[PDB]
Design a protein around this ligand. Sequence first.
Ligand SMILES: *[C@@H]1O[C@H](CO)[C@@H](O[C@@H]2O[C@H](CO)[C@@H](O[C@@H]3O[C@H](CO[C@H]4O[C@H](CO)[C@@H](O)[C@H](O)[C@@H]4O)[C@@H](O)[C@H](O[C@@H]4O[C@H](CO)[C@@H](O)[C@H](O)[C@@H]4O[C@H]4O[C@H](CO)[C@@H](O)[C@H](O)[C@@H]4O[C@@H]4O[C@H](CO)[C@@H](O)[C@H](O)[C@@H]4O)[C@@H]3O)[C@H](O)[C@H]2NC(C)=O)[C@H](O)[C@H]1NC(C)=O
Ligand SMILES: *[C@@H]1O[C@H](CO)[C@@H](O[C@@H]2O[C@H](CO)[C@@H](O[C@@H]3O[C@H](CO[C@H]4O[C@H](CO)[C@@H](O)[C@H](O)[C@@H]4O)[C@@H](O)[C@H](O[C@H]4O[C@H](CO)[C@@H](O)[C@H](O)[C@@H]4O[C@H]4O[C@H](CO)[C@@H](O)[C@H](O)[C@@H]4O)[C@@H]3O)[C@H](O)[C@H]2NC(C)=O)[C@H](O)[C@H]1NC(C)=O
Ligand SMILES: *[C@@H]1O[C@H](CO[C@H]2O[C@@H](C)[C@@H](O)[C@@H](O)[C@@H]2O)[C@@H](O[C@@H]2O[C@H](CO)[C@@H](O[C@@H]3O[C@H](CO[C@@H]4O[C@H](CO)[C@@H](O)[C@H](O[C@H]5O[C@H](CO)[C@@H](O)[C@H](O)[C@@H]5O)[C@@H]4O)[C@@H](O)[C@H](O)[C@@H]3O)[C@H](O)[C@H]2NC(C)=O)[C@H](O)[C@H]1NC(C)=O
Ligand SMILES: *[C@@H]1O[C@H](CO[C@H]2O[C@@H](C)[C@@H](O)[C@@H](O)[C@@H]2O)[C@@H](O[C@@H]2O[C@H](CO)[C@@H](O[C@@H]3O[C@H](CO[C@H]4O[C@H](CO)[C@@H](O)[C@H](O)[C@@H]4O)[C@@H](O)[C@H](O[C@H]4O[C@H](CO)[C@@H](O)[C@H](O)[C@@H]4O)[C@@H]3O)[C@H](O)[C@H]2NC(C)=O)[C@H](O)[C@H]1NC(C)=O
Ligand SMILES: *[C@H]1O[C@H](CO[C@H]2O[C@@H](C)[C@@H](O)[C@@H](O)[C@@H]2O)[C@@H](O[C@@H]2O[C@H](CO)[C@@H](O[C@@H]3O[C@H](CO)[C@@H](O)[C@H](O[C@@H]4O[C@H](CO)[C@@H](O)[C@H](O)[C@@H]4O)[C@@H]3O)[C@H](O)[C@H]2NC(C)=O)[C@H](O)[C@H]1NC(C)=O
Ligand SMILES: *[C@@H]1O[C@H](CO)[C@@H](O[C@@H]2O[C@H](CO)[C@@H](O[C@@H]3O[C@H](CO[C@H]4O[C@H](CO)[C@@H](O)[C@H](O)[C@@H]4O)[C@@H](O)[C@H](O)[C@@H]3O)[C@H](O)[C@H]2NC(C)=O)[C@H](O)[C@H]1NC(C)=O
Ligand SMILES: *[C@@H]1O[C@H](CO[C@H]2O[C@@H](C)[C@@H](O)[C@@H](O)[C@@H]2O)[C@@H](O[C@@H]2O[C@H](CO)[C@@H](O[C@@H]3O[C@H](CO)[C@@H](O)[C@H](O)[C@@H]3O)[C@H](O)[C@H]2NC(C)=O)[C@H](O)[C@H]1NC(C)=O
Ligand SMILES: *[C@@H]1O[C@H](CO[C@H]2O[C@@H](C)[C@@H](O)[C@@H](O)[C@@H]2O)[C@@H](O[C@@H]2O[C@H](CO)[C@@H](O[C@H]3O[C@H](CO)[C@@H](O)[C@H](O)[C@@H]3O)[C@H](O)[C@H]2NC(C)=O)[C@H](O)[C@H]1NC(C)=O
Ligand SMILES: *[C@H]1O[C@H](CO[C@H]2O[C@@H](C)[C@@H](O)[C@@H](O)[C@@H]2O)[C@@H](O[C@@H]2O[C@H](CO)[C@@H](O)[C@H](O)[C@H]2NC(C)=O)[C@H](O)[C@H]1NC(C)=O
Ligand SMILES: *[C@H]1O[C@H](CO)[C@@H](O[C@@H]2O[C@H](CO)[C@@H](O)[C@H](O)[C@H]2NC(C)=O)[C@H](O)[C@H]1NC(C)=O
Ligand SMILES: *[C@@H]1O[C@H](CO)[C@@H](O)[C@H](O)[C@H]1NC(C)=O
Ligand SMILES: *[C@@H]1O[C@H](CO)[C@@H](O)[C@H](O)[C@H]1NC(C)=O
Length: 304
Amino acid sequence: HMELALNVTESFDAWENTVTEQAIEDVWQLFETSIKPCVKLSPLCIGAGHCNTSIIQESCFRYCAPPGYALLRCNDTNYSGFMPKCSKVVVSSCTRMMETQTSTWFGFNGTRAENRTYIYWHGRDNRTIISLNKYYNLTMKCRGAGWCWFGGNWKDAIKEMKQTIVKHPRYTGTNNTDKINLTAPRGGDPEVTFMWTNCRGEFLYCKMNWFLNWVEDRDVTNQRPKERHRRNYVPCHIRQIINTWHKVGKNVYLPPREGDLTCNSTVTSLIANIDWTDGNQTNITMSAEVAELYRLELGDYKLV
Ligand SMILES: *[C@@H]1O[C@H](CO)[C@@H](O[C@@H]2O[C@H](CO)[C@@H](O[C@@H]3O[C@H](CO[C@H]4O[C@H](CO)[C@@H](O)[C@H](O)[C@@H]4O)[C@@H](O)[C@H](O[C@@H]4O[C@H](CO)[C@@H](O)[C@H](O)[C@@H]4O[C@H]4O[C@H](CO)[C@@H](O)[C@H](O)[C@@H]4O[C@@H]4O[C@H](CO)[C@@H](O)[C@H](O)[C@@H]4O)[C@@H]3O)[C@H](O)[C@H]2NC(C)=O)[C@H](O)[C@H]1NC(C)=O
Ligand SMILES: *[C@@H]1O[C@H](CO)[C@@H](O[C@@H]2O[C@H](CO)[C@@H](O[C@@H]3O[C@H](CO[C@H]4O[C@H](CO)[C@@H](O)[C@H](O)[C@@H]4O)[C@@H](O)[C@H](O[C@H]4O[C@H](CO)[C@@H](O)[C@H](O)[C@@H]4O[C@H]4O[C@H](CO)[C@@H](O)[C@H](O)[C@@H]4O)[C@@H]3O)[C@H](O)[C@H]2NC(C)=O)[C@H](O)[C@H]1NC(C)=O
Ligand SMILES: *[C@@H]1O[C@H](CO[C@H]2O[C@@H](C)[C@@H](O)[C@@H](O)[C@@H]2O)[C@@H](O[C@@H]2O[C@H](CO)[C@@H](O[C@@H]3O[C@H](CO[C@@H]4O[C@H](CO)[C@@H](O)[C@H](O[C@H]5O[C@H](CO)[C@@H](O)[C@H](O)[C@@H]5O)[C@@H]4O)[C@@H](O)[C@H](O)[C@@H]3O)[C@H](O)[C@H]2NC(C)=O)[C@H](O)[C@H]1NC(C)=O
Ligand SMILES: *[C@@H]1O[C@H](CO[C@H]2O[C@@H](C)[C@@H](O)[C@@H](O)[C@@H]2O)[C@@H](O[C@@H]2O[C@H](CO)[C@@H](O[C@@H]3O[C@H](CO[C@H]4O[C@H](CO)[C@@H](O)[C@H](O)[C@@H]4O)[C@@H](O)[C@H](O[C@H]4O[C@H](CO)[C@@H](O)[C@H](O)[C@@H]4O)[C@@H]3O)[C@H](O)[C@H]2NC(C)=O)[C@H](O)[C@H]1NC(C)=O
Ligand SMILES: *[C@H]1O[C@H](CO[C@H]2O[C@@H](C)[C@@H](O)[C@@H](O)[C@@H]2O)[C@@H](O[C@@H]2O[C@H](CO)[C@@H](O[C@@H]3O[C@H](CO)[C@@H](O)[C@H](O[C@@H]4O[C@H](CO)[C@@H](O)[C@H](O)[C@@H]4O)[C@@H]3O)[C@H](O)[C@H]2NC(C)=O)[C@H](O)[C@H]1NC(C)=O
Ligand SMILES: *[C@@H]1O[C@H](CO)[C@@H](O[C@@H]2O[C@H](CO)[C@@H](O[C@@H]3O[C@H](CO[C@H]4O[C@H](CO)[C@@H](O)[C@H](O)[C@@H]4O)[C@@H](O)[C@H](O)[C@@H]3O)[C@H](O)[C@H]2NC(C)=O)[C@H](O)[C@H]1NC(C)=O
Ligand SMILES: *[C@@H]1O[C@H](CO[C@H]2O[C@@H](C)[C@@H](O)[C@@H](O)[C@@H]2O)[C@@H](O[C@@H]2O[C@H](CO)[C@@H](O[C@@H]3O[C@H](CO)[C@@H](O)[C@H](O)[C@@H]3O)[C@H](O)[C@H]2NC(C)=O)[C@H](O)[C@H]1NC(C)=O
Ligand SMILES: *[C@@H]1O[C@H](CO[C@H]2O[C@@H](C)[C@@H](O)[C@@H](O)[C@@H]2O)[C@@H](O[C@@H]2O[C@H](CO)[C@@H](O[C@H]3O[C@H](CO)[C@@H](O)[C@H](O)[C@@H]3O)[C@H](O)[C@H]2NC(C)=O)[C@H](O)[C@H]1NC(C)=O
Ligand SMILES: *[C@H]1O[C@H](CO[C@H]2O[C@@H](C)[C@@H](O)[C@@H](O)[C@@H]2O)[C@@H](O[C@@H]2O[C@H](CO)[C@@H](O)[C@H](O)[C@H]2NC(C)=O)[C@H](O)[C@H]1NC(C)=O
Ligand SMILES: *[C@H]1O[C@H](CO)[C@@H](O[C@@H]2O[C@H](CO)[C@@H](O)[C@H](O)[C@H]2NC(C)=O)[C@H](O)[C@H]1NC(C)=O
Ligand SMILES: *[C@@H]1O[C@H](CO)[C@@H](O)[C@H](O)[C@H]1NC(C)=O
Ligand SMILES: *[C@@H]1O[C@H](CO)[C@@H](O)[C@H](O)[C@H]1NC(C)=O
């Protein structure tokens, strides 16, 4: 009934890619499904070099949400990532996600969001993904047509990130200095920084830029450097038809609504996919989705 192994391969690629693609490509294949016609079958996957279809039944009132799909983890700690000599495992299934709230930047409710800024990290050496977590104040809330709001010391909290991100690379090998800046896609040049947000069903898109202006160095100065008085909101324009970040493509969905909705959200789980591959590379990113939602409570998702 539940047969599975722990054996995930890593390489290069991106377009035909790997599990990562199959995960989302089909995760939304799932999210089209809640109800509609008068019939029977569709699939389930990830496991043993064969694939499952999950056939459903009914005729032609409360329901949970996912017609078939589920999730489950191991145990024994907070979280690390990999090289795990595993043991115990658990139950779980229901998935109502769309109904609630999300982002592509900062995972929501904190859960013992401790002063000690946490750089929780699933290693894969050079090419990998992280998760920072600080107590400090940050608050994120969106309004109507598509413009979002904030509170908290994001400059300093960012410095914390910056102050939290220096002490792990211990003297790599030489006498140095470090310049930090940001990019996302692979194989083509855009120039823009897009976060998403979910609360109340609508998959609302954001042209977040002023927020993401930051250039970063080891030991700096700003007296004779430049000063202007800029401030912030979010020029979000909802894209139900989903123009895509990591590749200029498209998606869509089927949500209810509450007319005069004003999206609100709790903060903390600031993320990145740092690219420090040999040479002059220390590349922050920002593409971490649905899989992280539960990868947020557990430590690491396992669906199937
Ligand atoms: C969904 O959940 C959300 C959870 O976050 C919730 O939103 C949050 O609610 C709270 C309470 O309403 C918010 O507080 C408010 O937020 C404003 C945020 O704007 C700040 O941050 C931005 C980013 O940096 C920036 O754009 C702005 O510059 C700004 O800093 C606040 O402005 C505001 O705080 C108070 O402002 C008034 C007006 O002066 C004061 O009465 C009050 O005390 C706060 O600020 C003062 O107080 C401190 C110390 O208390 C002072 O040092 C400071 O100078 C200032 O005035 C002073 O008053 C004190 C006396 O008390 C004293 O020191 C001096 O005499 C001085 O004059 C505001 O209340 C929270 O920020 C917000 N989150 C977001 C997002 O903004 C949300 O509502 C919820 N949805 C629902 C269901 O409603
Ligand atoms: C990845 O890519 C980056 C960017 O290309 C690269 O960074 C470059 O590093 C080199 C290291 O050689 C830098 O060269 C140095 O530049 C400084 C001054 O520039 C900096 O400071 C000013 C002011 O703050 C800034 O405006 C500017 O942006 C820079 O940050 C020079 O002063 C250095 O010269 C000293 O060292 C030389 C040896 O290379 C000596 O020959 C020279 O004499 C200087 O020191 C001497 O002075 C003493 C007297 O004061 C004397 O007594 C001693 O004898 C002593 O020798 C230095 O040439 C270069 O600027 C960086 N690039 C850019 C574009 O700015 C990274 O290195 C790279 N990373 C990897 C891993 O490849
Ligand atoms: C991380 O960010 C840093 C800053 O990022 C800014 O730039 C963009 C990338 C945007 O994102 C923007 O929003 C950011 O604010 C990067 O540091 C610098 O990045 C910039 C831009 O990429 C580089 O700037 C260069 O400037 C060149 C100017 O060339 C002139 O050449 C003339 C002929 O030689 C020369 O005369 C002239 O003037 C000189 O002379 C006077 C008088 O003697 C002297 O005082 C001057 O200093 C001059 O030497 C000019 O020098 C331009 O031609 C280039 O095309 C280029 O754009 C710059 O290389 C880089 N500097 C540093 C600090 O290395 C950082 O690279 C980013 N890092 C990463 C990894 O992305
Ligand atoms: C899988 O395992 C994780 C930890 O690894 C495990 O290591 C081996 C040895 C295993 O055999 C396990 O025993 C051990 O769990 C789990 O993470 C931890 O899980 C527990 C329970 O799931 C969490 O405790 C819960 O949260 C509250 C925190 O308090 C804790 O600390 C104090 C002091 O030690 C104790 O008083 C508590 O017992 C906790 O240990 C706590 O308030 C909760 O108690 C409430 O709930 C009960 C039951 O409903 C209720 O009756 C009572 O009145 C309380 O209101 C609760 O026990 C622990 O905090 C958590 N740690 C982390 C990592 O956050 C993981 O949960 C587990 N299963 C999963 C979900 O995969
Ligand atoms: C992951 O983080 C948790 C969260 O705890 C944090 O809570 C906040 C409030 C801060 O205080 C922060 O510092 C703290 O880490 C860690 O959970 C605690 O860890 C301590 C020690 O690491 C635990 O105390 C243990 O109690 C057992 C009883 O069975 C005792 O035997 C332990 O001694 C050994 O610990 C070794 C590793 O620490 C282990 O290899 C040995 O086998 C041996 O068991 C130890 O004294 C305590 O239970 C936890 N308390 C709380 C508040 O959760 C956790 O350690 C972090 N994970 C790792 C891998 O470090
Ligand atoms: C993370 O961010 C990085 C930058 O923000 C990204 O790396 C950059 O990727 C682009 C696209 O491939 C490269 O751009 C090319 O650069 C070369 C270099 O020519 C220069 O050097 C020679 C010799 O020194 C000199 O003669 C020239 O004058 C130039 O100064 C150009 O030839 C190309 O036209 C093209 O612009 C960058 O090289 C590269 N930066 C680095 C590391 O050098 C990175 O892709 C981002 N990663 C992710 C995952 O998003
Ligand atoms: C960042 O969050 C903290 C949390 O406090 C908030 O808690 C929630 C539940 C809500 O009710 C909201 O109103 C609270 O502000 C805030 O920082 C702390 O705020 C309290 C007062 O609200 C401070 O206590 C006071 O401290 C001063 C100086 O010591 C004294 O004058 C008072 O007597 C009283 O003790 C406390 O110091 C603040 N410090 C901490 C621990 O963070 C803060 O409002 C919030 N920042 C924002 C707006 O983003
Ligand atoms: C990022 O990873 C690369 C290489 O990735 C390696 O990962 C392991 C898990 C295997 O998959 C292996 O096949 C693969 O090559 C790193 O390259 C390694 O860098 C090491 C540190 O510089 C380096 O070790 C030292 O020893 C050699 C002599 O053996 C010496 O010349 C070096 O100066 C160095 O001190 C090693 O040479 C090199 N690869 C190997 C195994 O030969 C890369 O450094 C990692 N970089 C970052 C920035 O994370
Ligand atoms: C929460 O606790 C931190 C403790 O930070 C210390 O431990 C690690 C997180 C590590 O990064 C280490 O460098 C750091 O010292 C408090 O930061 C404190 O700031 C004061 C400034 O006077 C100093 O005493 C210390 O540098 C530092 N730690 C200690 C010992 O407290 C932080 O301010 C505190 N804040 C809250 C809200 O709980
Ligand atoms: C690379 O730069 C570092 C910068 O610290 C040099 O380290 C210094 O080494 C000298 C001797 O070469 C020592 O006296 C100092 O203690 C070090 N720096 C200081 C001032 O604390 C290192 O020497 C350089 N590498 C070389 C020249 O190969
Ligand atoms: C991968 O999983 C298979 C079972 O599907 C297992 O036999 C094998 O040991 C794993 N390969 C490794 C070691 O990565
Ligand atoms: C595949 O999953 C479906 C869920 O509907 C189940 O009916 C079927 O038994 C599964 N097939 C196998 C043997 O994996």
